[PDB]
Amino acid sequence: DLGKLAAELSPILGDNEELQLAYKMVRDLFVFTSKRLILIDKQGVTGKKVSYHSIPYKAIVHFQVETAGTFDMDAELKLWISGQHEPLVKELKRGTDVVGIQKTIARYALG
Amino acid sequence: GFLDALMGNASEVDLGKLAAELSPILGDNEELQLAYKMVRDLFVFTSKRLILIDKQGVTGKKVSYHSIPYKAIVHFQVETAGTFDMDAELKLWISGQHEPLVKELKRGTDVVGIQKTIARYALG
Amino acid sequence: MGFLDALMGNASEVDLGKLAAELSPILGDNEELQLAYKMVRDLFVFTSKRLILIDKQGVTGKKVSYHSIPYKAIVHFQVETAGTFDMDAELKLWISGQHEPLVKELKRGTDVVGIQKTIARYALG
Amino acid sequence: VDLGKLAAELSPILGDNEELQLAYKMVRDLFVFTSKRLILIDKQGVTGKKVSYHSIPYKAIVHFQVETAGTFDMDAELKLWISGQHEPLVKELKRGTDVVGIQKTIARYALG
Amino acid sequence: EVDLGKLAAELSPILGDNEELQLAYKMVRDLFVFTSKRLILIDKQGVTGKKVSYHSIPYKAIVHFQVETAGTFDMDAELKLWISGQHEPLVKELKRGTDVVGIQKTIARYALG
């Protein structure tokens, strides 16, 4: 829900920045603004910590979706961030918008 | 129709069929433009990125769609023995990465078309 | 204003006039200080051209470090809940060429929300 | 180097609107400067079985160095640091190589 | 050797067409020469000075930089300059009595514009 979300995030958004799309991942929230991808996660030994990882779109230097199998396929998203050897890795679970998120990442990363 | 491909212009890949199939993961502002076959795999050139589509595993049932934005291709290289027996190799270096993406270009692959096409999009 | 907005701003406030007078020998003639945040152990100085991150370093804390970070060098950044009681925050700034982030403590009571907004403003924009 | 001949021989991998401008031939390396990139062609050494064709757009050349090398510092060594790398591309410019020319040409293309 | 004219005589053949020498600083082991297009580090080594390197750093390749004060009297203030495409920073002692503040201002003028 973009409304509860804009209300929560607004104090750390730029003045002209706007929330445009959001996707619920397994443990993550993928928040697409006009300027950056914000990954909102639950960290810690339990789940008390919260992280907001701001990724400007020009920092997404390559990305990949890999599926395994024919029926009931596994799908995994990899997003490589400039300067990082390891990619961010996200399961595209039996519950995630597999195609939408790829189209959105493409839309923002390619411009 | 490989001979049809040779004999002038005709892409060896069915570009129309490929566009229909990839449509759900392409941007509304994005067009499929050219594609080359590397054995069972594909080098797909859109108006915005190179998409490497590789079938992996014994069955070829594990498929990766690896997208490289043209603006992120920093430099590139083909190492080749021409028509001596050996295969060629492509290296693509990507912005803010350290190691290149490495792809074998098996003998018979249109390595010259791939190179010229990369130059077209990576310079632009 | 919110009940604590005024105080949080004063808590990490620095006199820019005094700071400009002292930093001016190393600033470009076309450079102005715009904002500054005095956090727990670091002074974040936002100029029109770079973040100058100032802190004490050395084996016995006798050195002073002036780290100039042009805004174009900030590749990505993260803020996370920090501290045993989960009151504070930890900022990670990834600078171009460095695979490890600069890690900085931000304490509740200071302008933690403000500094995140400022980083977003300059790095994005 | 006959530039007209080289331009025709490289034409299959050049853009239609790309001009070959200058070329420098070393022992195992051929530095080709086009309007759009340096194509560094390395035909390798005595155990070589392939040729490397390395296209380096000028904007990827982030800094560079020439240093004296060899016995009595009569040869030179070129280092080209390229965007995204940790370590440079290293090439030997033996005495008799156009060391000053190559340096000036890189300055003209890589500065901006 | 910080005479800009002598540095021009030495560097002329490798300079671009409308490139001018503007400032030069003597460091402990090299020279930082600021041209209108690049920082050129000149290191002439040995007793005979035969081993020479010219390291050209376009100003856009200066990613970030840091100056740390000495702290104690047996140490120098230190400059680190991180350059694109090179993992390790360039590290240079800023010796007492030299233009320690000036070189920082110069780096900021050229790198930041």
Author numbering:
A (entry chain E): 15 to 125
B (entry chain B): 2 to 125
C (entry chain A): 1 to 125
D (entry chain C): 14 to 125
E (entry chain D): 13 to 125
Can you quote the paper on this entry?
As part of our structural genomics effort in targeting novel protein families, we determined crystal structures of three bacterial proteins from a previously structurally uncharacterized protein family Pfam PF08000 [also known as domain of unknown function family 1696 (DUF1696)],11 which appears to be involved in the bacterial cell envelope stress response. These structures share a common domain that is surprisingly similar to the eukaryotic PH-like domains, thus providing the first direct evidence for the existence of PH-like domains in prokaryotes. PHb1 and PHb2 share a common domain that is structurally similar to eukaryotic PH domains, which we have defined as a PHb domain (PH domain in bacteria). The PHb proteins form oligomeric ring assemblies of different sizes and symmetries, providing an excellent example of how molecular architecture can evolve, where the general form of the molecular assembly is preserved, but its size is expandable.
Structure determination of full-length (sa) was enabled using reductive methylation of the protein prior to crystallization. The two PHb1s are closely related (80% sequence identity); PHb1(sa) can be aligned to PHb1(sl) without gaps except for an extra glycine at its C-terminus. The PHb1(sa) model consists of 585 protein residues, 2 polyethylene glycol (PEG) fragments, 6 glycerols, and 242 waters, and PHb2 has 1106 residues and 173 waters. The N-terminal residues, which were deleted in the PHb1(sl) construct, are ordered in two monomers (A and B) of PHb1(sa) due to crystal contacts and form a short helix (α-1, residues 5–11). The conformation of the N-terminal region differs significantly between PHb1(sa) and PHb1(sl). PHb1(sa) does not contain the first strand (β0) found in PHb1(sl). These structural variations, which likely reflect differences in the contact environments in the crystals, demonstrate the inherent flexibility of the PHb domains. The PHb1(sa) pentamer is similar to that of PHb(sl); thus, we refer only to PHb1(sl) in the discussion hereafter. The PHb domains in two PHb1 orthologs contain a structurally conserved core, except for the N-termini (before α0), the L34 loop, and the L56 loop regions that are highly variable in conformation. The 10 copies of the PHb1 monomers [from the two pentamers of PHb1(sl) and PHb1(sa)] can be superimposed with an average rmsd of 1.31 Å for 94 aligned Cα atoms; the rmsd values between different monomers are significantly higher if all variable regions were included.
